[PDB]
């Protein structure tokens, strides 16, 4: 076992192996705190995440397991992966803290959209990278569900990775079918979010700044139109249909006019991503092949993920069982060497 050393950072205690030095808090992100650090073994700058109350309840214990499982699975340049996972506990009975370690990126897409206004060329490269990561995640039967600029980490190299998959005001990037509470949504939920993000990078403003679920829907429908007959036929919920069909009908706007000065390829991709009916929305793989990404696209360099066992998601287990499963996964971890 390595030697651990202990310190307090913003009320939080951190017990990490001596290999990680100069810890510096870089913010709380719900369910955990993050420090930047220097990894003496690799020479790399890393982010270390301490999970908050990983075993507080069955929900938390299952969530801790899920995140560790997801992170051990993801091995892709545009998806956050694991350099290390550790606990200061020397046995299962002593196990109550999980630390997760990844390459430090040091910014997010908000930190890039803000005050700086990106060229079409930067937009192509950033969105290419999101789609490249999404192709991979989607190939493992994983849906992000909460893609937004603050979940997209970007380094000084303009290299991007998706954070917080499978687990700043999130509702602005949410697919309309989720605002309506549909339980059978598909992976193109994430493509909607990409469309909202891409629009924001092109225009410098939030495409749909909703104040609540209902206001969000209204803003979406003014751009994309109220549902046509084919989509209306697909809504089971009487309450949902009463509401939608009770709104004043709106036509789909002309995207070429809304995004007036943008690359006409960017506009074309936007309208394929922001299709109301999720069954008609472009997939991540299809989007990568869109002419907008001509300068970046290579099918031989856009890998798919190994099979991911999500069967645990259906299981109703005790806290101690989720805890022991998580311990097993910490101990079996094999670093990228």
Ligand X SMILES: CNC(=O)c1ccc(C)c(-n2c(C)cc(OCc3ccc(F)cc3F)c(Br)c2=O)c1
Ligand Y SMILES: Fc1ccc(-c2c[nH]nc2-c2ccnc(F)c2)cc1
Considering the rule CB under 6 A, would residue 68 count as an interface residue with ligand X? no
Report how far residue 61's alpha carbon sits from residue 66's, in angstroms, rounded to the nearest whole number: 9
- The catalytically annotated residue of 146, 164, 277, 316 is 164
CB of 9 to ligand X, least distance (A): 14
Range in contact with ligand X (rule: CB under 6 A) among 8-16, 44-52, 123-131, 312-320: 44-52
Question: Which of ligand X, ligand Y, none is residue 167 near (CB under 5 to 8 Å by kind)?
Answer: none
Question: Which of ligand Y, ligand X, none is residue 237 near (CB under 5 to 8 Å by kind)?
Answer: ligand Y
Q: For ligand Y, how many residues bind (rule: CB under 6 A)?
A: 14
Read out DSSP for 17-58? ETTEEEEEEEEE-SSEEEEEEEETTT--EEEEEEESSTTSSH
Considering the rule CB under 6 A, would residue 231 count as an interface residue with ligand Y? yes
Report how far residue 65's alpha carbon sits from residue 57's, in angstroms, rounded to the nearest whole number: 12
Considering the rule CB under 6 A, would residue 147 count as an interface residue with ligand X? no
Q: Which of 83, 276, 287, 325 binds ligand Y (CB under 6 A)?
A: 276
Q: What b-and-e string marks burial along 18-56, b requiring 16 or more CB atoms within 10 Å of the CB?
A: ebbeebeebeeeebbbbbbbbbeeeeeebbbbbbbebbe
Coil, strand, or helix at residue 298?
Answer: coil
Do the Cβ atoms of 109 and 202 come closer than 8 Å? no
Residue 241's CB is within 10 A of a number of other CB atoms, namely 14
Considering the rule CB under 6 A, would residue 180 count as an interface residue with ligand Y? yes
Backbone angles phi, psi at 44, to 5 degrees: -90, 150
Q: Which of 3, 27, 291, 332 binds ligand X (CB under 6 A)?
A: 27
DSSP code at position 284 = H
Report how far residue 176's alpha carbon sits from residue 153's, in angstroms, rounded to the nearest whole number: 25
Name the nearest CA neighbour of 266 among 187, 201, 204, 176: 201
Range in contact with ligand Y (rule: CB under 6 A) among 23-31, 69-77, 137-145, 226-234: 226-234
Tell whether 246 is in a known binding site: no
- The residues in 71-130 that bind ligand X, with binding defined as CB under 6 A, are 71, 80, 82, 100-102, 104-108
Q: Which of 26, 58, 253, 258 binds ligand X (CB under 6 A)?
A: 26
Annotated catalytic residue 164: yes
Q: Which of 34, 37, 142, 244 binds ligand X (CB under 6 A)?
A: 34
Give me the active site residues, please.
164
Query: Where on the chain is the footprint of ligand Y (CB under 6 A)?
Result: 176-177, 180, 182, 227, 231, 234-235, 237, 240, 244, 276-278
């Amino acid at each position: 076992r390595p030697t651990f050393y202990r310190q307090e950072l913003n009320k939080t205690i951190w017990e990490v192996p001596e290999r990680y030095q100069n810890l510096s808090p870089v913010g709380s992100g719900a369910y955990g705190s993050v420090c930047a650090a220097f990894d003496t073994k690799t020479g790399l700058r890393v982010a270390v995440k301490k999970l908050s109350r990983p075993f507080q309840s069955i929900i938390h214990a299952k969530r801790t397991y899920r995140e560790l499982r997801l992170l051990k699975h993801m091995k892709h340049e545009n998806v956050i992966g694991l350099l290390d996972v550790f606990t200061p506990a020397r046995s299962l009975e002593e196990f109550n803290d999980v630390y997760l370690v990844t390459h430090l990126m040091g910014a997010d897409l908000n930190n890039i959209v803000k005050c700086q206004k990106l060229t079409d060329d930067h937009v192509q490269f950033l969105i290419y990278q999101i789609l490249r990561g999404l192709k991979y995640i989607h190939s493992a039967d994983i849906i992000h569900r909460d893609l937004k600029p603050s979940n997209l980490a970007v380094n000084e190299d303009c290299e991007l990775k998706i954070l917080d998959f499978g687990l700043v005001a999130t509702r602005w990037y949410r697919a309309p079918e989720i605002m309506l509470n549909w339980m059978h949504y598909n992976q193109t939920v994430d493509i909607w979010s990409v469309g909202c993000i891409m629009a924001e990078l092109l225009t410098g403003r939030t495409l749909f700044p909703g104040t609540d679920h209902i206001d969000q829907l209204k803003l979406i429908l003014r751009l994309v139109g109220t549902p046509g007959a084919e989509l209306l036929k697909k809504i089971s919920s009487e309450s949902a249909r009463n509401y939608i069909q009770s709104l004043t009908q709106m036509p789909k706007m002309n995207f070429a006019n809304v995004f007036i000065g943008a690359n006409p390829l960017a506009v074309d991709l936007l309208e394929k991503m922001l299709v109301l009916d999720s069954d008609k929305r472009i997939t991540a793989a299809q989007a990568l092949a869109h002419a907008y990404f001509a300068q970046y696209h290579d099918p031989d360099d856009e890998p798919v993920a190994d099979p991911y066992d999500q069967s645990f998601e259906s299981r109703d287990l005790l806290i101690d069982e989720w805890k022991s499963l998580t311990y097993d996964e910490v101990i079996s971890f094999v670093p990228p060497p």
